[PDB]
Amino acid sequence: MTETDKKQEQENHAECEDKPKPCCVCKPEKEERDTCILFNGQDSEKCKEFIEKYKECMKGYGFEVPSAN
Ligand SMILES: [Cu+]
């Protein structure tokens, strides 16, 4: 029995989905980032500051991050 379509593609937003399985070691900074982008609008320094601080606090004895390298 054949079929027209079934397999879903599902693409990403821009590039690199990031975020593996954010365990319990990561939660507060996450809320701080969301709030920062909520009030600001990501139009403030691109909020890259929180991204770097996060990747810096996680890549070092933190947990795990896929990234795009
Ligand atoms: Cu975590």
UniProtKB/Swiss-Prot annotation:
CHCH domain location: 23-65
Binding site for Cu cation: C23, C24
PROSITE patterns in UniProt: CHCH
Residues spanning the membrane: none
Main location: mitochondrion
Pfam families (alphabetical): COX17 (PF05051)
Official protein name in the record: Cytochrome c oxidase copper chaperone
PANTHER family in alphabetical order: CYTOCHROME C OXIDASE COPPER CHAPERONE (PTHR16719:SF0)
Entry superkingdom: Eukaryota
BP terms from Gene Ontology: copper ion transport; mitochondrial cytochrome c oxidase assembly; protein farnesylation
Molecular-function GO term, any one: cuprous ion binding
Motif Cx9C motif 2, chain ranges: 47-57
Location(s) in or outside the cell: Mitochondrion intermembrane space
InterPro entries: Cys_alpha_HP_mot_SF (IPR009069), Cyt_c_oxidase_Cu-chaperone (IPR007745)
Physiological role: Copper chaperone for cytochrome c oxidase (COX). Binds two copper ions and deliver them to the Cu(A) site of COX.
Keyword flag Metal-binding: yes
Sequence similarity: Belongs to the COX17 family.
Motif placement: Cx9C motif 1: 26-36
A cellular component annotation (GO) from this entry: mitochondrial intermembrane space
Entry keywords, A to Z: Chaperone, Copper, Disulfide bond, Metal-binding, Mitochondrion
Disulfides per UniProt: C26-C57, C36-C47
Organism field: Saccharomyces cerevisiae (strain ATCC 204508 / S288c) (Baker's yeast)
Gene from which the chain derives: COX17
